Amino acid sequence: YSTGSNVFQTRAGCLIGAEHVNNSYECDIPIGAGICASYQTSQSIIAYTMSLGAENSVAYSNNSIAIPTNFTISVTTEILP
Amino acid sequence: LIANQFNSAIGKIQDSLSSTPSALGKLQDVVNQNAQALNTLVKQLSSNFGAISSVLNDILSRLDPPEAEVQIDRLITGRLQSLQTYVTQQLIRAAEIRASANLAATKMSECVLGQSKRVDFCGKGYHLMSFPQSAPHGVVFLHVTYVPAQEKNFTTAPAICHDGKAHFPREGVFVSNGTHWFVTQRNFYEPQIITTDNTFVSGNCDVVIGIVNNTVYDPLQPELDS
Amino acid sequence: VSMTKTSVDCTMYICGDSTECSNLLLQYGSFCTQLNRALTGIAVEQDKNTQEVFAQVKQIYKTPPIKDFGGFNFSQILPDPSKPSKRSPIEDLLFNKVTKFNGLTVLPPLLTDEMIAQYTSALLAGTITSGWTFGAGPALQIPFPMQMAYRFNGIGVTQNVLYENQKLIANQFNSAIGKIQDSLSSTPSALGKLQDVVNQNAQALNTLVKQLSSNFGAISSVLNDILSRLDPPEAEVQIDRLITGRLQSLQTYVTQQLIRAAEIRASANLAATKMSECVLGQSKRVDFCGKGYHLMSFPQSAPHGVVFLHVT
Ligand SMILES: *[C@@H]1O[C@H](CO)[C@@H](O[C@@H]2O[C@H](CO)[C@@H](O)[C@H](O)[C@H]2NC(C)=O)[C@H](O)[C@H]1NC(C)=O
Ligand SMILES: *[C@@H]1O[C@H](CO)[C@@H](O)[C@H](O)[C@H]1NC(C)=O
Ligand SMILES: *[C@@H]1O[C@H](CO)[C@@H](O)[C@H](O)[C@H]1NC(C)=O
Ligand SMILES: *[C@@H]1O[C@H](CO)[C@@H](O)[C@H](O)[C@H]1NC(C)=O
Numbered sequence: 001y002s003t004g005s006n007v008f009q010t011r012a013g014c015l016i017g018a019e020h021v022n023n024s025y026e027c028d029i030p031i032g033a034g035i036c037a038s039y040q041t042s043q044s045i046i047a048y049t050m051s052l053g054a055e056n057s058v059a060y061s062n063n064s065i066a067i068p069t070n071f072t073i074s075v076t077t078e079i080l081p
Numbered sequence: 082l083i084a085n086q087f088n089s090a091i092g093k094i095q096d097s098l099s100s101t102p103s104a105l106g107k108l109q110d111v112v113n114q115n116a117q118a119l120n121t122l123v124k125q126l127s128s129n130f131g132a133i134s135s136v137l138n139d140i141l142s143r144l145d146p147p148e149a150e151v152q153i154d155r156l157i158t159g160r161l162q163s164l165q166t167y168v169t170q171q172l173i174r175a176a177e178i179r180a181s182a183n184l185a186a187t188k189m190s191e192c193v194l195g196q197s198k199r200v201d202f203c204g205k206g207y208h209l210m211s212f213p214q215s216a217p218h219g220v221v222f223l224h225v226t227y228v229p230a231q232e233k234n235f236t237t238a239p240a241i242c243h244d245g246k247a248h249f250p251r252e253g254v255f256v257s258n259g260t261h262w263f264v265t266q267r268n269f270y271e272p273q274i275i276t277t278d279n280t281f282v283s284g285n286c287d288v289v290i291g292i293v294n295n296t297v298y299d300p301l302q303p304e305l306d307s
Numbered sequence: 308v309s310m311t312k313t314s315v316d317c318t319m320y321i322c323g324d325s326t327e328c329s330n331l332l333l334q335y336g337s338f339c340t341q342l343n344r345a346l347t348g349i350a351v352e353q354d355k356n357t358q359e360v361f362a363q364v365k366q367i368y369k370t371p372p373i374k375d376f377g378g379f380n381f382s383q384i385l386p387d388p389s390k391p392s393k394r395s396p397i398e399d400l401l402f403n404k405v406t407k408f409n410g411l412t413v414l415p416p417l418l419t420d421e422m423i424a425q426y427t428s429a430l431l432a433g434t435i436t437s438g439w440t441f442g443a444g445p446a447l448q449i450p451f452p453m454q455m456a457y458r459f460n461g462i463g464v465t466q467n468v469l470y471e472n473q474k475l476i477a478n479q480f481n482s483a484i485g486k487i488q489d490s491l492s493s494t495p496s497a498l499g500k501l502q503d504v505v506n507q508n509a510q511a512l513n514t515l516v517k518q519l520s521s522n523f524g525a526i527s528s529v530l531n532d533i534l535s536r537l538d539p540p541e542a543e544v545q546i547d548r549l550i551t552g553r554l555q556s557l558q559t560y561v562t563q564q565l566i567r568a569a570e571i572r573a574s575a576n577l578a579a580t581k582m583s584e585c586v587l588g589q590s591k592r593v594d595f596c597g598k599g600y601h602l603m604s605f606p607q608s609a610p611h612g613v614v615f616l617h618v619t
């Protein structure tokens with residue numbers, strides 16, 4: 001794809017065919033240098049800075065503790081050659 | 082309830098393995114890497130490497146042995162280099178797989194054959210069990226782990242000042258629901274009345290920062306009174 | 308944790324803009340394709356190493372606006388808003404201490420130094436506020452003196468000791484952090500491992516570039532002079548000799564890179580294990596995390612690596 005269709009410049013290199021969005025999303029296709037691409041919504045390929053996760057501040061207070069009341073017995077699968 | 086959670090967890094393992102095609106990506110990648118290595122080694126026979134032909138039978142049939150020897154030597158250099166590259170790549174891959182097999186043996190010994198306190202070694206959470214499951218050229222572990230789920234805020238105090246002597250939780254946490262103070266397990270909210278049995282006294286109320294005033298029930302007193 | 312993410316264009320390295328050398332290379336088989344595959348595997352492995360070491364946390368945590376941690380001072384390890392890049396003072400000195408286009412490319416890392424510092428800050432905030440609970444479930448708030456009392460309980464010292472020595476312990480922790488600060492500031496070989504990795508990769512690359520300039524038994528090292536001086540018949544054999552030399556040199560580079568990447572992956576797995584068992588929990592393994600009975604650990608992102616401040 002030559003130039004002239006959603007040309008976007010990132011630190012990885014020239015990116016053609018994806019639109020640069022200002023929002024932050026989980027990384028889907030690792031373009032590089034912190035930029036990921038994904039197929040989102042009509043439909044087009046988007047490029048964005050990856051979102052490391054929901055920025056939640058723990059309500060720390062020198063006086064308060066949080067003890068869980070219920071648990072879950074979760075089974076995790078781990079594959080090893 | 083724990084039995085139902087465990088059974089549903091196992092069923093979800095089966096469903097997730099069934100539906101997801103990339104569940105066994107590690108083993109499939111190992112097999113694919115080996116297949117690609119063998120395929121490259123086999124396809125290396127088709128390369129001339131600078132000789133007149135890639136098949137040495139045709140070289141011997143066509144040219145006289147004196148001048149054919151240099152072409153056969155070129156073919157030998159090329160194929161020997163290809164074999165050397167394949168063997169070196171296989172040695173490095175065997176080092177990777179031996180590291181992974183030592184890790185798998187360690188996981189077997191420490192999680193199937195016991196309970197491991199190493200964090201995130203066997204499952205995300207407080208590890209409970211682990212079940213090996215044989216897989217083609219590999220092993221699959223079903224790490225049964227304990228994960229807390231429903232948490233609620235509480236007011237905590239490092240010590241309870243009673244009779245001027247600080248009381249500390251023997252094996253628990255001091256928490257309050259605003260009005261009353263309780264000593265509680267660390268990982269599961271179970272409030273008990275503060276008592277000399279679950280608290281060990283050591284020190285004075287002035288030293289501790291954040292100590293709070295409260296009364297520690299003494300089991301002995303009712304027997305004396307009655 | 309990770310080594311420089313480099314890729315080498317085999318066809319461009321062995322032969323420049325010339326097409327005759329490319330034709331002579333195509334008859335060597337799939338050597339260049341295999342070398343490119345190996346180098347790309349190494350690059351993706353470096354990205355996986357950094358991911359596995361740092362993205363141990365599910366959600367980016369954040370410290371409270373006011374740092375009232377019972378006297379424990381984390382200013383040297385927590386990010387400072389003043390400087391443009393939110394790196395801690397210790398992270399700043401770690402980054403300060405550590406200090407080619409013949410088909411040679413250096414692919415940028417997938418995780419920018421800024422988001423690596425963001426993972427490090429999230430791990431620090433979770434460790435400070437929630438203790439080790441943020442690695443085994445939902446992050447669970449707890450006052451830091453209480454968390455360090457639990458760590459004392461872990462090492463076999465009853466929590467009496469800390470609450471009765473909170474001021475002295477806080478001063479000792481702050482002074483230890485400050486002395487770590489100054490010892491990193493002064494000693495030149497403090498960050499020897501990361502600098503050794505960087506220097507080794509740079510020396511390998513420079514060796515490859517110099518090997519571009521070797522005769523390898525040919526008439527001359529430069530390609531165009533070989534092409535001009537000789538007719539196509541003898542040019543073919545001279546180019547074949549030069550191709551064998553350059554291919555052997557690049558294969559040596561790729562093999563050494565594979566071995567070095569295996570070593571770096573072993574170190575990155577060790578770093579991931581240290582993060583999991585010492586930042587996300589308190590480990591009873593002896594001498595695994597610091598000389599002494601382990602209390603905590605603080606990750607600090609360093610160029611192409613990680614630094615642990617094992618509080619013992
Ligand atoms: C702890 O969690 C379990 C589920 O993880 C709860 O059990 C469920 O309770 C709901 C009530 O709305 C029922 O509809 C479900 O059938 C129950 N079982 C399961 C497997 O979901 C349990 O009540 C919780 N305990 C506490 C004290 O909150
Ligand atoms: C994204 O943010 C930058 C900086 O504020 C701004 O210049 C740009 O217009 C924004 N793009 C969109 C699509 O809003
Ligand atoms: C605890 O309190 C904080 C602020 O008061 C709040 O953000 C948090 O959600 C509370 N925790 C729970 C479990 O409600
Ligand atoms: C706290 O728990 C006690 C249990 O003994 C109960 O009597 C009291 O009403 C509770 N108070 C609040 C504010 O939840």
Ligand SMILES: *[C@@H]1O[C@H](CO)[C@@H](O)[C@H](O)[C@H]1NC(C)=O
Nearest residue numbers: 061062063290291292375377
């Ligand atoms: C918590 O900090 C507040 C801030 O002023 C202070 O008033 C209070 O005494 C502190 N409590 C503990 C237990 O440290």
Ligand SMILES: *[C@@H]1O[C@H](CO)[C@@H](O)[C@H](O)[C@H]1NC(C)=O
Nearest residue numbers: 242244245286292293294295
């Ligand atoms: C706790 O009670 C004692 C008397 O029993 C009193 O001297 C002290 O001031 C009280 N502490 C607080 C924090 O009110």
Ligand SMILES: *[C@@H]1O[C@H](CO)[C@@H](O)[C@H](O)[C@H]1NC(C)=O
Nearest residue numbers: 374378379380381382383485
């Ligand atoms: C923590 O240390 C820094 C310098 O190391 C100092 O500026 C700051 O005031 C200290 N914090 C407290 C609460 O004393």
